[PDB]
Enzyme design. Structure first.
Site, short mmCIF file in Angstrom:
data_model
loop_
_atom_site.label_atom_id
_atom_site.label_comp_id
_atom_site.label_asym_id
_atom_site.label_seq_id
_atom_site.Cartn_x
_atom_site.Cartn_y
_atom_site.Cartn_z
N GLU A 193 0.79 -1.21 0.00
CA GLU A 193 0.00 0.00 0.00
C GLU A 193 0.82 1.27 0.00
OE1 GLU A 193 -3.77 -1.72 -0.17
OE2 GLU A 193 -2.97 0.28 -0.43
N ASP A 201 -6.28 6.78 -5.21
CA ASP A 201 -6.24 5.31 -5.41
C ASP A 201 -5.74 5.04 -6.79
OD1 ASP A 201 -8.54 2.95 -4.35
OD2 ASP A 201 -8.07 4.89 -3.44
N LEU A 219 -8.94 4.12 2.50
CA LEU A 219 -9.90 4.81 1.60
C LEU A 219 -10.77 5.82 2.37
CD1 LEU A 219 -11.32 4.97 -1.03
CD2 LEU A 219 -13.07 3.50 0.00
N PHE A 234 -8.51 -6.48 2.78
CA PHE A 234 -8.10 -5.11 3.00
C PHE A 234 -8.27 -4.28 1.72
CE2 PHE A 234 -5.64 -2.21 5.68
CZ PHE A 234 -5.13 -1.28 4.78
N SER A 242 -12.35 -19.73 -6.61
CA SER A 242 -11.00 -19.74 -6.06
C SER A 242 -11.04 -20.12 -4.61
CB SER A 242 -10.29 -18.40 -6.06
OG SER A 242 -10.34 -17.77 -7.32
N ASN A 245 -6.86 -19.61 -11.37
CA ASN A 245 -8.22 -19.04 -11.28
C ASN A 245 -8.26 -17.58 -10.76
OD1 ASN A 245 -11.14 -18.79 -9.67
ND2 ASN A 245 -11.15 -19.90 -11.62
#
Length: 164
Positions: free
Chosen positions: A11, A20, A32, A104, A117, A132
């Site tokens: 991040e 973003d 965010l 997250f 998945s 996948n």
């Protein structure tokens, strides 16, 4: 390596409001603020989040506080989620971090949508699940990050993050 170090590689840390990969207003370690186009709505969310008048800027300290909350909420969300909990419980410690990372970034809802998945990870079919997971908007939009997370699920160790 741990969840915090991992997420902080993925991040980064920014002490001023920023956009973003998605164009959304964010601050700190991937926190965010709003999906709204106004910097003003973002500033107001920020001050609400910190409990002070920040003027779009926070300290390291405030950034890590937000990060601790976010990580805690991600884990709790996983544990509360009927689709996520069983997969989480079935996984080893390292792979558990990979699922937390996805939650997250994309939220509970988003991850719970990767039905097939999830099924493969539960079954411990690591190579199949990695193929996948790659078939997603997620991978196509943030390929270097998705690939780190994907390798992590594949191998069960921290090598993708060694480099970094």
């Amino acid at each position: 390596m741990n969840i915090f170090e991992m997420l902080r590689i993925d991040e980064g840390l920014r002490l001023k409001i920023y956009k973003d990969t998605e164009g959304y207003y964010t601050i700190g370690i991937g926190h965010l603020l709003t999906k709204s186009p106004s910097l003003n709505a973002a500033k107001s969310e920020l001050d609400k989040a910190i409990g002070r008048n920040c003027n779009g800027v926070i300290t390291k300290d405030e950034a890590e506080k937000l990060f601790n909350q976010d990580v805690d909420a991600a884990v709790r969300g996983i544990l509360r989620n009927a689709k996520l909990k069983p997969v989480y419980d079935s996984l080893d410690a390292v792979r558990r971090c990979a699922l937390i990372n996805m939650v997250f970034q994309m939220g509970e809802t988003g991850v719970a949508g990767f039905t097939n998945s999830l099924r493969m990870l539960q079954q411990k079919r690591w190579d199949e699940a990695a193929v996948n997971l790659a078939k997603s908007r997620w991978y196509n939009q943030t390929p270097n990050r998705a690939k780190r997370v994907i390798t992590t699920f594949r191998t069960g160790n921290w090598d993708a993050y060694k480099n970094l």
